[PDB]
Amino acid sequence: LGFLGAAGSTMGAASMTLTVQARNLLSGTVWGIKQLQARVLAVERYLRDQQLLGIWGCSGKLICCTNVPWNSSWSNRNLSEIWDNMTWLQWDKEISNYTQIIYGLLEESQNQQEKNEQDLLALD
Amino acid sequence: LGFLGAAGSTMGAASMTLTVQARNLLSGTVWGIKQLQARVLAVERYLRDQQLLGIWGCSGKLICCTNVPWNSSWSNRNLSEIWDNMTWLQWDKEISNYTQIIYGLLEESQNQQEKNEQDLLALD
Amino acid sequence: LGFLGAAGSTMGAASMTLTVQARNLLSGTVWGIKQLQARVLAVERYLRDQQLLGIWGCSGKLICCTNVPWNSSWSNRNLSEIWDNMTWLQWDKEISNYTQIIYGLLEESQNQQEKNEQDLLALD
Amino acid sequence: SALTQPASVSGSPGQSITISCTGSSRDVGGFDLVSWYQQHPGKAPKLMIYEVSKRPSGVSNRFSASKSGNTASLTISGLQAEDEADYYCYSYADGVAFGGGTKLTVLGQP
Amino acid sequence: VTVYYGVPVWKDAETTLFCASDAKTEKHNVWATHACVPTDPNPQEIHLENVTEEFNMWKNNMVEQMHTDIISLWDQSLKPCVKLTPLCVTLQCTNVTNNITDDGELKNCSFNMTTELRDKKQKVYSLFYRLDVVQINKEYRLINCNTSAITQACPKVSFEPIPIHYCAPAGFAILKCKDKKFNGTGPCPSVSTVQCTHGIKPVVSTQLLLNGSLAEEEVMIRSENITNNAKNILVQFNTPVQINCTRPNNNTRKSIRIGPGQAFYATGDIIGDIRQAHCNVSKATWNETLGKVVKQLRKHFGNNTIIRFANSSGGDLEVTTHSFNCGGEFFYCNTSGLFNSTWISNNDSITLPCRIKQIINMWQRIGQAMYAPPIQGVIRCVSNITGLILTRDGGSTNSTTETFRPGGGDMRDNWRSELYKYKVVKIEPLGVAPTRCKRRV
Amino acid sequence: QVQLVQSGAQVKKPGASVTVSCTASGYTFTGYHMHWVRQAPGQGLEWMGWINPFRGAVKYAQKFRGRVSMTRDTSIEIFYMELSRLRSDDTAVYYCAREMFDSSADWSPWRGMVAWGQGTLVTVSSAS
Ligand SMILES: *[C@@H]1O[C@H](CO)[C@@H](O[C@@H]2O[C@H](CO)[C@@H](O[C@@H]3O[C@H](CO)[C@@H](O)[C@H](O[C@@H]4O[C@H](CO)[C@@H](O)[C@H](O)[C@@H]4O)[C@@H]3O)[C@H](O)[C@H]2NC(C)=O)[C@H](O)[C@H]1NC(C)=O
Ligand SMILES: *[C@@H]1O[C@H](CO)[C@@H](O[C@@H]2O[C@H](CO)[C@@H](O[C@@H]3O[C@H](CO)[C@@H](O)[C@H](O[C@H]4O[C@H](CO)[C@@H](O)[C@H](O)[C@@H]4O)[C@@H]3O)[C@H](O)[C@H]2NC(C)=O)[C@H](O)[C@H]1NC(C)=O
Ligand SMILES: *[C@@H]1O[C@H](CO)[C@@H](O[C@@H]2O[C@H](CO)[C@@H](O[C@H]3O[C@H](CO)[C@@H](O)[C@H](O)[C@@H]3O)[C@H](O)[C@H]2NC(C)=O)[C@H](O)[C@H]1NC(C)=O
Ligand SMILES: *[C@@H]1O[C@H](CO)[C@@H](O[C@H]2O[C@H](CO)[C@@H](O[C@H]3O[C@H](CO)[C@@H](O)[C@H](O)[C@@H]3O)[C@H](O)[C@H]2NC(C)=O)[C@H](O)[C@H]1NC(C)=O
Ligand SMILES: *[C@@H]1O[C@H](CO)[C@@H](O[C@@H]2O[C@H](CO)[C@@H](O)[C@H](O)[C@H]2NC(C)=O)[C@H](O)[C@H]1NC(C)=O
Ligand SMILES: *[C@@H]1O[C@H](CO)[C@@H](O[C@@H]2O[C@H](CO)[C@@H](O)[C@H](O)[C@H]2NC(C)=O)[C@H](O)[C@H]1NC(C)=O
Ligand SMILES: *[C@@H]1O[C@H](CO)[C@@H](O[C@@H]2O[C@H](CO)[C@@H](O)[C@H](O)[C@H]2NC(C)=O)[C@H](O)[C@H]1NC(C)=O
Ligand SMILES: *[C@@]1(*)O[C@H](CO)[C@@H](O[C@@H]2O[C@H](CO)[C@@H](O)[C@H](O)[C@H]2NC(C)=O)[C@H](O)[C@H]1NC(C)=O
Ligand SMILES: *[C@@H]1O[C@H](CO)[C@@H](O)[C@H](O)[C@H]1NC(C)=O
Ligand SMILES: *[C@@H]1O[C@H](CO)[C@@H](O)[C@H](O)[C@H]1NC(C)=O
Ligand SMILES: *[C@@H]1O[C@H](CO)[C@@H](O)[C@H](O)[C@H]1NC(C)=O
Ligand SMILES: *[C@@H]1O[C@H](CO)[C@@H](O)[C@H](O)[C@H]1NC(C)=O
Ligand SMILES: *[C@@H]1O[C@H](CO)[C@@H](O)[C@H](O)[C@H]1NC(C)=O
Ligand SMILES: *[C@@H]1O[C@H](CO)[C@@H](O)[C@H](O)[C@H]1NC(C)=O
Ligand SMILES: *[C@@H]1O[C@H](CO)[C@@H](O)[C@H](O)[C@H]1NC(C)=O
Ligand SMILES: *[C@@H]1O[C@H](CO)[C@@H](O)[C@H](O)[C@H]1NC(C)=O
Ligand SMILES: *[C@@H]1O[C@H](CO)[C@@H](O)[C@H](O)[C@H]1NC(C)=O
Ligand SMILES: *[C@@H]1O[C@H](CO)[C@@H](O)[C@H](O)[C@H]1NC(C)=O
Ligand SMILES: *[C@@H]1O[C@H](CO)[C@@H](O)[C@H](O)[C@H]1NC(C)=O
Ligand SMILES: *[C@@H]1O[C@H](CO)[C@@H](O)[C@H](O)[C@H]1NC(C)=O
Ligand SMILES: *[C@@H]1O[C@H](CO)[C@@H](O)[C@H](O)[C@H]1NC(C)=O
Ligand SMILES: *[C@@H]1O[C@H](CO)[C@@H](O)[C@H](O)[C@H]1NC(C)=O
Ligand SMILES: *[C@@H]1O[C@H](CO)[C@@H](O)[C@H](O)[C@H]1NC(C)=O
Known about the structure:
Radius of gyration of chain D: 13 Å
Largest interface: A-E, 66 and 51 residues
Strand content of chain D: 35-45%
Number of helices of chain D: 0
Helix content of chain E: under 10%
Number of strands of chain D: 9
Structural class of chain E: mainly beta
Number of helices of chain E: 4
Largest sheet of chain D: 6 strands, mixed
Radius of gyration of chain E: 26 Å
Helix content of chain D: under 10%
Distance between the termini of chain D: 25 Å
Distance between the termini of chain E: 16 Å
Number of strands of chain E: 30
Strand content of chain E: 35-45%
Largest sheet of chain E: 10 strands, mixed
Bound molecules: a molecule of 4 linked components (NAG-NAG-BMA-BMA), a molecule of 4 linked components (NAG-NAG-BMA-MAN), a molecule of 3 linked components (NAG-NAG-MAN), a molecule of 2 linked components (NAG-NAG), 2-acetamido-2-deoxy-beta-D-glucopyranose
Oligomer: part of a larger assembly
Shape of chain D: globular
């Protein structure tokens, strides 16, 4: 539905619109230096996103899977009431409480643990 | 044969020289601001190419198969009539009109289907 | 152990600090033009390294193996006296004379081959 | 004046007193910009406190003031000699208005 | 768990916004658009549903960016033009007008000026305005001769406000509040995204938002807080008000030489009758527009109260009057007749005196002044009025009457009138989620 | 430092006009509002108006509109307070009060006006 097209749509319907805004994340002297610094900021942020995705145990775009359970303190709800009754904006508004340590453990216990025994069970 | 070496060579032979130019796609005041602008353009264009290559569902390099049918109309030829008859230059010249729809369709119809039922088949 | 933290650590433990410097590699007017130049240089170097990892047969982080043979010219010695007798510092100091040719070999002899027979066996 | 103030308060040093700057429902309870001033005799007024339930810098903690709904209050602790001056209540409601004035006596006769 | 890449996430953030302008006439690097990239030929405006965003046009940081950008662009376009440091010189200046008050406001000053050869000096004359010179103790001198360095805007460039689109970079999207009844703060029922904004004319004006956006079919009185009188009250009209701004004096431009390579364009004799500029506004249409605006004002102050309009209280000439540009020079209309009505419960055109002022120190940057060159011939322009920068006078103990007066001065209010319904949000396509999937070992 | 030096005392006849200066020093002149406060001897405290030094925006009091006129000169960094149509009750000492916060604050022009000047006493008496 275009850039941010399914912003308010339910997540189940929003599971197929990852592509449009994955694609539109690159968009292809004073008063001209603004263009240069803006594009440098854009490319640097895109690399933040890609490096965060890659360093995690996914290396896969728009979707991945993992081996870490769900901490019982992060918005403990059911599948239906999270995947059908709510939209991404309200969810990431009510989930920004631990996102930092969510990513911290999702990288530690995955890249240096799960990928650690990946290295080991390929090294054995 | 070096960067853009086997440009006029047959596509079957051109498949063996892809990496010599994939390697050289980064190449490592006024009259010096041109260097900065050129390097920013080069790095952003390479990241655009990598974003396209990854969003298409492969994220691999120099080879990318998929699950989207190539209708005969676009080809209007056979395996030998494409991989031997003409090189990539005139092939692109004769196909440089559908590449937008080609890219969009092989990206959407591949990803948002194969990845979704891949998550589904791993959901059981 | 922080950026470049476990540099003096032997590879037995230094193999487990790779994610740290992978995460901090890109580290998340005059007197301000240096900031822009430094950040664009960091982006360019990081993407050059990622491209080298990409044109190689790894497509991943912290690990990849391959089928290309190893050369005695490259510090001919047994596993024990290269993984427990030296660290990467001295070893690199004694192998930083073949880096170009080792990269070229482990690139072409498999990416120009093993992906090709991979496509050929998927072509059956 | 839109603000009504007590004429004078009397006492000794050391205890604690309150200066009630009562007003209207549109001045003290309406907003939250009530302030208090300190004017020495023959000297330009000084800001003895920032606002209701708010103390600024350059003044001691001895000035504790708030607003009790329709009746703003200034409570001065640690009564001492230097406090001998005239205090003006200052609120905020459109065009600026000032209190009539609150005289006070310390360590002296009423 | 499971992370998704490309999750529809935005957060309030600030970033540098580049531009985009129409390709439709370079006119030697017009002030607005010289190096601005071409606009998007087809502005895809994407609408959204189930979307609610906390808009705040007064805490918006876009307006600060555009204000600083306009300052820098003006300084940059003004930098390479002619310096006017040699104009600081004793002006032997005399009145022009024989009959009493046939027109001051026109001063014929004869002075000295160094020619191409430094050895020789030339005696030249010019027609200055009263607001441009002050008397020294008759001998006059330029008003900004002791506080700044006068710099003539090189007349190759124009002062045309060209429509400008500020387009956010990659990873940043601009949200448009497309709902009709928009107050200025709070949730927006109809939030829609776009690459970037409509054509913004960066006009410079006070007390009247000339050539503004009038899409608001309702007179929405805006302000960061109604109860605060000292904060300007923003008003945006629905029906445009036509204005006939003219400079009937026919000026001829004399290129007095301040070489080598420098030219000082001084006004020659006014060929024709000596007149003063008049800014006409239709009395009727202005009346009904004031009626609409007061009907909407009564919704913010009681149910039925006296609303009085009066001329500007006081201050600088650029605040007590209507500053703007018509066809290449700056002048002011006191608009003392457009604000004189008092309304309790419920064919011609009003004419306003308008005073020319060539030398201008707009934006109050003392570090640099400016000298607007004369424009040959009669200047005529028609603009449309879409808003009022009104300020509320202080009330009293019993405020049964509330008097509204024009304000402005701070140009940020001029820019807020065009960026009220826009805001930038950065995209965070990284986000975890709970799933039943499981990666293999 | 912050010092608001005013002019010396003046003696006036009712029906005349009085002007007073209040120079500012040691701070950014075009960012802080300046309240003008009048004090008759022995009675309460009242208000003239506040000047925004940027572009000279002013706002007077309801009971002083038509009599007071306030201006400023940014170059020399001083303030002007001109009062005309003097009356017998206008005999007072006038105070110029610099505000505490910058003009861009939420409630900047209605804040506590921490800084005050020395004050100029004007005597308007029918006696000569
Ligand atoms: C709001 O929008 C109004 C409509 O655009 C605008 O008024 C018109 O503005 C244009 C541009 O300034 C005026 O036309 C130009 O005027 C200058 C000065 O006279 C001319 O130099 C210029 O070119 C010349 O035009 C002559 C004929 O008029 C021609 O003989 C010369 O060779 C040369 O081409 C333009 O004519 C126009 O007259 C204005 N009025 C009309 C009737 O459209 C408002 O100024 C604008 N308001 C603001 C505040 O931006
Ligand atoms: C740069 O040049 C400008 C222009 O010459 C200059 O501006 C002038 O500054 C002086 C102060 O230095 C201003 O003088 C005052 O103006 C006010 C206007 O209301 C007068 O009230 C002042 O007092 C006189 O008038 C009173 C009337 O009641 C008398 O009671 C009193 O005794 C005085 O006679 C005083 O004249 C002047 O108005 C401005 N503007 C002009 C047009 O002169 C600026 O100061 C210069 N900058 C520097 C740093 O040199
Ligand atoms: C502003 O003052 C200017 C100087 O007085 C005046 O222009 C000058 O006017 C005189 C006449 O008063 C002209 O005199 C000459 O006129 C013709 C020219 O061929 C001949 O009779 C003689 O040569 C005679 O000297 C000046 O030529 C003329 N210009 C100059 C350069 O001095 C302006 O008209 C005045 N402007 C206004 C609007 O009042
Ligand atoms: C923005 O403007 C608000 C007023 O429009 C400010 O508010 C404060 O002042 C108003 C009166 O002007 C109070 O209004 C009423 O609130 C309740 C009734 O709803 C009662 O207390 C009473 O009837 C009041 O008159 C506000 O309550 C009051 N707010 C607070 C928090 O004290 C507001 O302060 C101002 N600024 C901001 C930051 O919002
Ligand atoms: C330009 O400079 C010359 C310098 O001499 C001025 O000349 C004098 O002008 C006065 C009148 O202003 C005469 O009384 C003198 O006799 C002149 N001196 C000479 C030597 O000619 C001249 O006036 C200046 N220009 C203008 C327009 O005043
Ligand atoms: C508002 O109106 C008043 C008159 O009611 C204007 O003041 C007069 O202006 C004229 C022309 O400049 C002067 O000749 C008078 O002496 C002024 N009278 C007084 C008492 O000052 C005032 O200038 C108007 N304001 C605006 C901005 O138009
Ligand atoms: C301004 O005045 C000049 C001078 O009169 C006008 O230019 C020409 O003047 C000659 C001599 O009077 C006339 O014969 C021409 O017809 C004038 N030009 C035109 C095109 O009519 C000039 O036109 C005047 N400008 C305006 C806008 O009135
Ligand atoms: C706009 O306001 C000015 C005053 O700032 C008015 O000026 C008039 O000026 C003449 C002298 O040129 C005086 O005789 C008048 O008394 C002034 N009128 C007022 C109201 O002060 C000007 O007329 C006003 N313009 C209007 C009313 O459209
Ligand atoms: C909005 O919500 C409805 C709920 O039924 C959904 O069908 C629709 O796709 C959503 N679309 C957007 C743009 O959020
Ligand atoms: C998850 O994190 C929370 C953080 O408070 C902790 O209490 C809990 O024990 C962790 N593990 C599980 C299984 O919930
Ligand atoms: C989670 O944290 C964010 C950021 O602090 C906060 O806005 C949100 O309300 C929190 N949700 C809760 C506490 O449920
Ligand atoms: C050019 O075409 C001929 C056709 O016989 C082929 O033999 C030759 O190798 C080709 N050269 C290159 C560089 O592809
Ligand atoms: C193949 O079919 C799809 C679906 O109808 C169409 O979009 C595409 O253009 C076709 N292209 C060909 C002829 O390969
Ligand atoms: C692309 O396809 C269209 C439609 O068949 C055709 O008109 C156009 O010439 C083609 N362009 C090429 C072959 O470069
Ligand atoms: C120091 O070197 C020894 C070599 O065996 C290694 O075991 C040890 O972990 C190293 N210590 C650190 C902190 O690098
Ligand atoms: C490896 O490469 C070197 C040259 O770089 C060569 O001398 C050597 O024979 C090769 N093979 C082995 C097994 O060392
Ligand atoms: C290059 O060869 C020299 C030969 O003495 C050796 O010492 C060195 O370690 C090699 N590698 C380098 C320079 O890193
Ligand atoms: C001449 O100029 C002076 C400048 O102050 C002005 O007052 C006067 O009205 C003008 N005209 C006459 C006839 O003096
Ligand atoms: C928001 O809208 C309401 C009317 O629905 C209005 O009363 C309020 O003042 C508005 N708030 C702002 C600050 O725009
Ligand atoms: C101003 O002039 C234009 C052009 O003649 C005219 O269309 C317009 O109606 C005039 N203004 C008014 C208010 O009538
Ligand atoms: C505006 O129109 C009304 C009639 O609708 C009239 O009573 C009023 O006097 C008019 N106001 C002006 C300023 O002409
Ligand atoms: C504005 O209205 C007042 C009402 O008393 C009147 O005196 C004044 O002349 C009017 N001004 C104009 C320009 O109509
Ligand atoms: C806005 O002004 C223009 C002239 O600049 C006029 O043509 C237009 O009709 C006015 N408003 C609208 C949208 O009607």
